[PDB]
């Protein structure tokens, strides 16, 4: 990581970030099996089998119930107006709000008749079969048959004549293990009103995620990267609910596609710099703060930091929350004296004091003479700085104090640089186009 | 594991329609990967013709069309002309072999009358015999069908020792030419009575005969 | 305006090494994956290698694994392909091609470069030997008579056949080279001239060799029979 | 239910709804127990106790982590720090902004020191005790003690000398039973960063909801109403996470208070009505659609239908998203000739065709002569209507067709009335104050 | 401007029925819960019934459960209280009061009405019996002379004792009635007049009874001893 | 289940401060309910004094105040004066009894000197004796301490048959009056030599005597 201080405009750039951006979504349709669990009954004393069977039937009833409430929130995806549907849509991330609509539109297509038939028909002989939909989209369909291969063949024989208390406890132990996944899935779908905010180890086991990621049509590097960032893949993918067609549970899960895997990216962070007099006590401020990334010779600009994450060097942004900017915009960081590109700048008559947290360094400005000092762990007070825009690294300082409010600094180490330049002496209007 | 198959050559005539097939497999096109077509002129680098199985980059004259279905794809040219005389390739991606290229086909247009070949036989020179070596130069040119076989028969015995027939190549005047070299020692150059360099052209055969002295 | 220029080709014996470079211009180099594609003489194309935009993920062809090495330099706008333990079947024309993908399931090389030729043979370079081809019977009279000189034993295909120092371009045609058993090349160029006027009318073929000079001029004259 | 059609202004009202309104929040503080699960160790091969003990301990580590993420997202929910606008808006701030902020502020008061000390100290002997906070607010505190009652006394004795594989398989399956509630609680808070959207069967089970609804200080009618609508009580309350204090989990759940339980309410829906000539082809529109409810002799107005629910006759509105309107506003539905109240109406030169679904009937507007026909199930096409503003009941028709788009009609049965009157012949300006 | 009016009070024998009413005005009636509060004569208040604003939830006091009936009619702005199987201990004054609350933990009756009275007794109506109290020794001379007439055995408390047709309002005072062991009521009213001027100077008291007329006029005269 | 307890009466003097305590229980006030105060004048319906445990509606003369803590609440009156003479009640809500009312206390102001009562005894009249019945009328009036007991003693034997003493009632001139009645048969009226009706007034005893004839 390399950070360069732009003393000319009191701004910073860190230029050592690889990035990954999502482009589209890959679907995946599951189907659980429970078998004819609703027919047999256990009505002879309280036993371990008894407390599990009724649990399964109650779960089935709950899952049937949840469908009448899921459908009510699908007409408010574009604009939710309820406590649940707003607080349940902010948990998916604001950038995902444009994809939940498409995911729901997919679910309506598949829950029709002759669609759940084809999905169930194409999985009659195996446990993995890619299938197409009515409108050309290809869907990877997966089947799990644990309960039905246990309830049917080696549970009904044990539970005969409704005599459900047996000295053989190995039967009881195995039932609990096979029953865990169904109960957790139904609980999650009942709780989140049908649209879960993140994949869990119950919707897709780690064995079924590696198979479902190496079967996508992609490059040979995008597969290797997702096989290493499984966790971030899990957090940024949601699942939908299709319905209960008999004694089986059908639901879909959406995975992200990393369309760009390697490209330089940088952060720009600025703070107001006046260097003015008491008269004309106004100065400039860069409003170009945010993220930058190159994909196809046209950088994408993210105005707010919250739309992107960090996992060391990689950066996990999205291509739907970004605004397209011509590549000449990088001239602003090089110098403001250049007039080829219209460089964004904003002014103001009321310079407030602020501290800027750089990923590597730290930028601080003090204006009204407030005591803002350098702090550390072993040394309580190191020095008192003067004026402002004194870019201070975490290498030299540990904490900074401003109005009895401390700010910590990161331990990340990297090459540091400062660019000498003459700040804006007095108020200038060569470039003040925006506001 | 898998490979893309493409027919060797396809012949056509001006103004008709020509179809070139690109058959895939279950691991390259069976996983919904793209098929793209490149045209390679005889002297320059390949250039993109079709990408995404149906799109056309700016510059193509709208007469090329492609289609993909299942594990097979095809390229369609409507209104074939004379300048579309080049090699064509179909590309794809494979699960375990990464980028794969098709076998490649060369399109031949049938719009030129057959031309009889001309053969020229050069008697071995006096100077070349000095350096204990005997060579015979036989050149064939000016023929449109490039299917020529050179057989060197000495008197009544066809000798197949030292024949160095090349591969026919096109020239400026849309014709083909080829050459065949054969080495002899000076002893057997004069030992035999006559030497000939026959050429075959779809049945047509032209013979030229040379003698060690041929003085009369 | 995109233009890719590659250089570094040459002749090398088997079990050697070579470095081929390709320099781009007219686009942001540090944003595109780049490949190396080769084509054997008279054969189909074949993919060789590929490197991402930051030298993170590298994929090699199965036939060249363990011997080649790809590299990048985002500041100098160039990439390199180190070759080691070259063999006779590695000769081809090598291309550098930029990558274009739609994101999921379409991958193609849109702006192909120009190409450089690499020959891997165990033979050594050797100066050409020019021998005459005098006109004789059955090769004269008629309308025109054919005559010329024979060029033999030139390894790296350099050939320049000028009769009147380049001023004789009326009935002269040069045949392509010939592949003998071992490492050596030969070709013949002849001129068709009327038999009515034949003699020493500047009938001297000029042959020049690039690696080793071996400049030699020979006069062809018509002998009896 | 009764619906009355108003051909004078082409609008309808249904005037048979009882209502309930939410007034305040009743808070409740829970405290799970896990016991000294972190000390005992299983160190002999893979066993049933092995795979569950490691599963439980992993939950505790994860739950401590999410507490460091809630503290970061509470700064974005209490003030527009870096919310930005961009696009794909979640539209936060509609109703929940004034509700989540109040709930969070209570959590900060609770999560201080000497407060959780009081809550835990008040529950030393019983599993239910009301307690007060520092600032006079009184909270209800509940302790749930199944795991601590099981891990402490009849699990440690079995697991001695780290010999954790025993022939007794009853304990192995039993441990899975008691563990299930805890694992669901931690998973919910992890996926929402601490703010769950609605109560689930694991934060507050049914036996713990009856005791938390019959202990509130309220009337004898409010208690009996909320006991019959547990589904909608659960669906309108959220929970917050306090933290992991020791070997226990502490979280709080907000319950709604229904301040009004019986009062008439009605819905008004309008449709464009021109009845104009080609010249001056413009007319009026009622922009006063929405809900109406009485609380204290002053109606509350909800501009759009999405803010309130329905469970038969009852209407579950909220008091924080309504605007106070003078009670004389009901006169508009009676007549427009009355000038006592300035009656809201808007005009427009571009009358479009549009169909409004009434809760009992249906409204249709059809101007440009497009084929707008009434439909049914047994009969495909019944009749072609003329112009528009022809109220059609669901008793007579099943579907309505406009621009090859069908609309279904509800099956609710109720009285229908039509009010004879003269529609607005030409453009008038006696009441067109708003626009 | 809020105003409540009660009506329907009266006297009923035990084991009967009666329908009290309360008519409101000055506020939106169909938005407030309404109550019925009673107070025994000379005792404390006590709650009797309650009803929400749409006759959905109805609460009754334990002491009167299963015998009363509260009802509403939002159209006529009134509520009713039908009673059945009335008992002796049920006589009181009945109030109708509007309900006020802050929403959670405060409930009070702000606009109390005026009230109506209900008497339950097994006795029957009976005209009063009048016996004048003649002046005698130790009850005259001194400063003034005291004389009056005694009214006895009138059931439903109507009493109007005006001596000179309402003109003798100088030294006349009326005492409260008294309850006998059975159902009866009696009182005595006396007039203080100077002993110097005593005789037939309009010294007669008028007795009137409302249910049964029993209009009797009895002259008071002074007798010896 | 639960009930609210209130003292029977509290007496004070003008110009001092008076406290009335309303004691609740664990289910009335312990469950965080409200206490409200109503004032009922001797002739009309109650009116709201304190609501919300501390608030005051418009019209309260800024001298009444109250507070609630635990299961007890109190009402405070500062600057007691004459017309604040009425009954005071405290209200609350109960879990099982719904709305509940306090016992009710009577506030007494001590600002008027004690006055001795006046007693008048009326002998039964002749026309009364005609209808085989004798009634003795005793009247007591004009006493400020409203606590008087009437004993009907005949000769030396106190007769306690037919005593019908009433309850004191406030007079127009802020005083009290009462009457005591006793019926007799005509035989008993003349049987004794004299009849008397005494009254006790805070220890003071005033008695009047009548005789069947009393003629001399």
PDB file of N, CA, C and O in Angstrom, chain F residues 129-168:
ATOM      1  N   UNK F 129    -105.088  10.867  69.810  1.00  0.00           N
ATOM      2  CA  UNK F 129    -105.574   9.818  70.698  1.00  0.00           C
ATOM      3  C   UNK F 129    -106.894   9.225  70.231  1.00  0.00           C
ATOM      4  O   UNK F 129    -107.235   8.109  70.638  1.00  0.00           O
ATOM      5  N   UNK F 130    -107.647   9.944  69.394  1.00  0.00           N
ATOM      6  CA  UNK F 130    -108.920   9.423  68.907  1.00  0.00           C
ATOM      7  C   UNK F 130    -108.720   8.160  68.079  1.00  0.00           C
ATOM      8  O   UNK F 130    -109.497   7.206  68.192  1.00  0.00           O
ATOM      9  N   UNK F 131    -107.685   8.134  67.245  1.00  0.00           N
ATOM     10  CA  UNK F 131    -107.389   6.961  66.425  1.00  0.00           C
ATOM     11  C   UNK F 131    -106.486   5.977  67.163  1.00  0.00           C
ATOM     12  O   UNK F 131    -105.449   5.558  66.652  1.00  0.00           O
ATOM     13  N   UNK F 132    -106.889   5.632  68.391  1.00  0.00           N
ATOM     14  CA  UNK F 132    -106.280   4.611  69.244  1.00  0.00           C
ATOM     15  C   UNK F 132    -104.757   4.565  69.159  1.00  0.00           C
ATOM     16  O   UNK F 132    -104.164   3.481  69.137  1.00  0.00           O
ATOM     17  N   UNK F 133    -104.114   5.730  69.131  1.00  0.00           N
ATOM     18  CA  UNK F 133    -102.666   5.791  69.016  1.00  0.00           C
ATOM     19  C   UNK F 133    -102.173   7.092  69.632  1.00  0.00           C
ATOM     20  O   UNK F 133    -102.871   8.109  69.610  1.00  0.00           O
ATOM     21  N   UNK F 134    -100.967   7.049  70.191  1.00  0.00           N
ATOM     22  CA  UNK F 134    -100.341   8.217  70.790  1.00  0.00           C
ATOM     23  C   UNK F 134     -98.922   8.360  70.261  1.00  0.00           C
ATOM     24  O   UNK F 134     -98.149   7.397  70.265  1.00  0.00           O
ATOM     25  N   UNK F 135     -98.586   9.563  69.806  1.00  0.00           N
ATOM     26  CA  UNK F 135     -97.265   9.860  69.275  1.00  0.00           C
ATOM     27  C   UNK F 135     -96.698  11.081  69.980  1.00  0.00           C
ATOM     28  O   UNK F 135     -97.360  12.120  70.071  1.00  0.00           O
ATOM     29  N   UNK F 136     -95.468  10.956  70.467  1.00  0.00           N
ATOM     30  CA  UNK F 136     -94.773  12.041  71.144  1.00  0.00           C
ATOM     31  C   UNK F 136     -93.729  12.620  70.202  1.00  0.00           C
ATOM     32  O   UNK F 136     -92.893  11.885  69.665  1.00  0.00           O
ATOM     33  N   UNK F 137     -93.779  13.934  70.004  1.00  0.00           N
ATOM     34  CA  UNK F 137     -92.928  14.627  69.044  1.00  0.00           C
ATOM     35  C   UNK F 137     -91.868  15.399  69.814  1.00  0.00           C
ATOM     36  O   UNK F 137     -92.192  16.236  70.666  1.00  0.00           O
ATOM     37  N   UNK F 138     -90.602  15.119  69.514  1.00  0.00           N
ATOM     38  CA  UNK F 138     -89.473  15.806  70.124  1.00  0.00           C
ATOM     39  C   UNK F 138     -88.605  16.384  69.018  1.00  0.00           C
ATOM     40  O   UNK F 138     -88.259  15.678  68.065  1.00  0.00           O
ATOM     41  N   UNK F 139     -88.258  17.661  69.142  1.00  0.00           N
ATOM     42  CA  UNK F 139     -87.518  18.376  68.114  1.00  0.00           C
ATOM     43  C   UNK F 139     -86.258  18.989  68.705  1.00  0.00           C
ATOM     44  O   UNK F 139     -86.305  19.632  69.758  1.00  0.00           O
ATOM     45  N   UNK F 140     -85.134  18.787  68.022  1.00  0.00           N
ATOM     46  CA  UNK F 140     -83.844  19.325  68.431  1.00  0.00           C
ATOM     47  C   UNK F 140     -83.261  20.094  67.255  1.00  0.00           C
ATOM     48  O   UNK F 140     -83.284  19.614  66.117  1.00  0.00           O
ATOM     49  N   UNK F 141     -82.741  21.289  67.525  1.00  0.00           N
ATOM     50  CA  UNK F 141     -82.234  22.139  66.458  1.00  0.00           C
ATOM     51  C   UNK F 141     -81.157  23.068  67.003  1.00  0.00           C
ATOM     52  O   UNK F 141     -80.986  23.217  68.215  1.00  0.00           O
ATOM     53  N   UNK F 142     -80.428  23.688  66.074  1.00  0.00           N
ATOM     54  CA  UNK F 142     -79.443  24.728  66.369  1.00  0.00           C
ATOM     55  C   UNK F 142     -78.333  24.216  67.291  1.00  0.00           C
ATOM     56  O   UNK F 142     -78.155  24.683  68.417  1.00  0.00           O
ATOM     57  N   UNK F 143     -77.580  23.242  66.786  1.00  0.00           N
ATOM     58  CA  UNK F 143     -76.381  22.764  67.463  1.00  0.00           C
ATOM     59  C   UNK F 143     -75.272  22.580  66.441  1.00  0.00           C
ATOM     60  O   UNK F 143     -75.488  21.973  65.388  1.00  0.00           O
ATOM     61  N   UNK F 144     -74.090  23.114  66.749  1.00  0.00           N
ATOM     62  CA  UNK F 144     -72.949  23.032  65.845  1.00  0.00           C
ATOM     63  C   UNK F 144     -72.257  21.673  65.923  1.00  0.00           C
ATOM     64  O   UNK F 144     -71.883  21.124  64.879  1.00  0.00           O
ATOM     65  N   UNK F 145     -72.040  21.092  67.116  1.00  0.00           N
ATOM     66  CA  UNK F 145     -71.567  19.701  67.149  1.00  0.00           C
ATOM     67  C   UNK F 145     -72.658  18.729  66.736  1.00  0.00           C
ATOM     68  O   UNK F 145     -73.601  18.483  67.494  1.00  0.00           O
ATOM     69  N   UNK F 146     -72.537  18.167  65.536  1.00  0.00           N
ATOM     70  CA  UNK F 146     -73.550  17.271  65.016  1.00  0.00           C
ATOM     71  C   UNK F 146     -73.493  15.879  65.608  1.00  0.00           C
ATOM     72  O   UNK F 146     -73.381  14.890  64.877  1.00  0.00           O
ATOM     73  N   UNK F 147     -73.571  15.786  66.936  1.00  0.00           N
ATOM     74  CA  UNK F 147     -73.555  14.492  67.622  1.00  0.00           C
ATOM     75  C   UNK F 147     -74.425  14.630  68.873  1.00  0.00           C
ATOM     76  O   UNK F 147     -73.957  15.072  69.924  1.00  0.00           O
ATOM     77  N   UNK F 148     -75.693  14.246  68.741  1.00  0.00           N
ATOM     78  CA  UNK F 148     -76.656  14.313  69.831  1.00  0.00           C
ATOM     79  C   UNK F 148     -77.379  12.977  69.923  1.00  0.00           C
ATOM     80  O   UNK F 148     -77.709  12.371  68.897  1.00  0.00           O
ATOM     81  N   UNK F 149     -77.605  12.512  71.148  1.00  0.00           N
ATOM     82  CA  UNK F 149     -78.321  11.270  71.406  1.00  0.00           C
ATOM     83  C   UNK F 149     -79.539  11.574  72.265  1.00  0.00           C
ATOM     84  O   UNK F 149     -79.436  12.302  73.257  1.00  0.00           O
ATOM     85  N   UNK F 150     -80.684  11.016  71.883  1.00  0.00           N
ATOM     86  CA  UNK F 150     -81.950  11.255  72.567  1.00  0.00           C
ATOM     87  C   UNK F 150     -82.369   9.967  73.260  1.00  0.00           C
ATOM     88  O   UNK F 150     -82.503   8.920  72.615  1.00  0.00           O
ATOM     89  N   UNK F 151     -82.580  10.046  74.570  1.00  0.00           N
ATOM     90  CA  UNK F 151     -83.065   8.927  75.366  1.00  0.00           C
ATOM     91  C   UNK F 151     -84.438   9.271  75.923  1.00  0.00           C
ATOM     92  O   UNK F 151     -84.622  10.338  76.518  1.00  0.00           O
ATOM     93  N   UNK F 152     -85.397   8.372  75.725  1.00  0.00           N
ATOM     94  CA  UNK F 152     -86.774   8.576  76.168  1.00  0.00           C
ATOM     95  C   UNK F 152     -86.950   7.861  77.503  1.00  0.00           C
ATOM     96  O   UNK F 152     -87.160   6.647  77.546  1.00  0.00           O
ATOM     97  N   UNK F 153     -86.865   8.617  78.593  1.00  0.00           N
ATOM     98  CA  UNK F 153     -87.020   8.071  79.935  1.00  0.00           C
ATOM     99  C   UNK F 153     -88.388   8.466  80.479  1.00  0.00           C
ATOM    100  O   UNK F 153     -88.733   9.652  80.505  1.00  0.00           O
ATOM    101  N   UNK F 154     -89.161   7.472  80.905  1.00  0.00           N
ATOM    102  CA  UNK F 154     -90.471   7.693  81.500  1.00  0.00           C
ATOM    103  C   UNK F 154     -90.362   7.483  83.005  1.00  0.00           C
ATOM    104  O   UNK F 154     -89.948   6.409  83.454  1.00  0.00           O
ATOM    105  N   UNK F 155     -90.737   8.508  83.773  1.00  0.00           N
ATOM    106  CA  UNK F 155     -90.583   8.497  85.224  1.00  0.00           C
ATOM    107  C   UNK F 155     -89.138   8.190  85.596  1.00  0.00           C
ATOM    108  O   UNK F 155     -88.241   9.002  85.347  1.00  0.00           O
ATOM    109  N   UNK F 156     -88.905   7.022  86.191  1.00  0.00           N
ATOM    110  CA  UNK F 156     -87.561   6.561  86.510  1.00  0.00           C
ATOM    111  C   UNK F 156     -87.123   5.394  85.635  1.00  0.00           C
ATOM    112  O   UNK F 156     -86.067   4.804  85.886  1.00  0.00           O
ATOM    113  N   UNK F 157     -87.902   5.049  84.615  1.00  0.00           N
ATOM    114  CA  UNK F 157     -87.608   3.903  83.755  1.00  0.00           C
ATOM    115  C   UNK F 157     -87.335   4.365  82.333  1.00  0.00           C
ATOM    116  O   UNK F 157     -88.266   4.833  81.648  1.00  0.00           O
ATOM    117  N   UNK F 158     -86.098   4.265  81.842  1.00  0.00           N
ATOM    118  CA  UNK F 158     -85.830   4.616  80.440  1.00  0.00           C
ATOM    119  C   UNK F 158     -86.467   3.631  79.473  1.00  0.00           C
ATOM    120  O   UNK F 158     -86.076   2.461  79.421  1.00  0.00           O
ATOM    121  N   UNK F 159     -87.448   4.093  78.705  1.00  0.00           N
ATOM    122  CA  UNK F 159     -88.155   3.248  77.751  1.00  0.00           C
ATOM    123  C   UNK F 159     -87.420   3.287  76.419  1.00  0.00           C
ATOM    124  O   UNK F 159     -87.107   4.365  75.901  1.00  0.00           O
ATOM    125  N   UNK F 160     -87.148   2.109  75.860  1.00  0.00           N
ATOM    126  CA  UNK F 160     -86.417   2.015  74.604  1.00  0.00           C
ATOM    127  C   UNK F 160     -87.224   1.248  73.564  1.00  0.00           C
ATOM    128  O   UNK F 160     -86.680   0.399  72.849  1.00  0.00           O
ATOM    129  N   UNK F 161     -88.519   1.539  73.472  1.00  0.00           N
ATOM    130  CA  UNK F 161     -89.412   0.902  72.510  1.00  0.00           C
ATOM    131  C   UNK F 161     -90.037   1.988  71.645  1.00  0.00           C
ATOM    132  O   UNK F 161     -90.782   2.837  72.147  1.00  0.00           O
ATOM    133  N   UNK F 162     -89.737   1.960  70.350  1.00  0.00           N
ATOM    134  CA  UNK F 162     -90.276   2.932  69.423  1.00  0.00           C
ATOM    135  C   UNK F 162     -89.427   4.162  69.202  1.00  0.00           C
ATOM    136  O   UNK F 162     -89.910   5.122  68.589  1.00  0.00           O
ATOM    137  N   UNK F 163     -88.181   4.172  69.679  1.00  0.00           N
ATOM    138  CA  UNK F 163     -87.313   5.328  69.489  1.00  0.00           C
ATOM    139  C   UNK F 163     -86.964   5.456  68.014  1.00  0.00           C
ATOM    140  O   UNK F 163     -86.523   4.490  67.375  1.00  0.00           O
ATOM    141  N   UNK F 164     -87.159   6.652  67.463  1.00  0.00           N
ATOM    142  CA  UNK F 164     -87.004   6.902  66.034  1.00  0.00           C
ATOM    143  C   UNK F 164     -86.208   8.177  65.798  1.00  0.00           C
ATOM    144  O   UNK F 164     -86.580   9.038  64.997  1.00  0.00           O
ATOM    145  N   UNK F 165     -85.090   8.316  66.506  1.00  0.00           N
ATOM    146  CA  UNK F 165     -84.243   9.490  66.345  1.00  0.00           C
ATOM    147  C   UNK F 165     -83.613   9.506  64.957  1.00  0.00           C
ATOM    148  O   UNK F 165     -83.140   8.481  64.458  1.00  0.00           O
ATOM    149  N   UNK F 166     -83.611  10.681  64.332  1.00  0.00           N
ATOM    150  CA  UNK F 166     -83.074  10.842  62.990  1.00  0.00           C
ATOM    151  C   UNK F 166     -81.598  11.228  63.062  1.00  0.00           C
ATOM    152  O   UNK F 166     -80.987  11.259  64.134  1.00  0.00           O
ATOM    153  N   UNK F 167     -81.009  11.530  61.908  1.00  0.00           N
ATOM    154  CA  UNK F 167     -79.632  11.953  61.707  1.00  0.00           C
ATOM    155  C   UNK F 167     -79.563  13.467  61.554  1.00  0.00           C
ATOM    156  O   UNK F 167     -80.446  14.066  60.930  1.00  0.00           O
ATOM    157  N   UNK F 168     -78.545  14.115  62.123  1.00  0.00           N
ATOM    158  CA  UNK F 168     -78.439  15.573  61.990  1.00  0.00           C
ATOM    159  C   UNK F 168     -78.346  15.996  60.532  1.00  0.00           C
ATOM    160  O   UNK F 168     -77.686  15.351  59.717  1.00  0.00           O
TER     161      UNK F 168
END
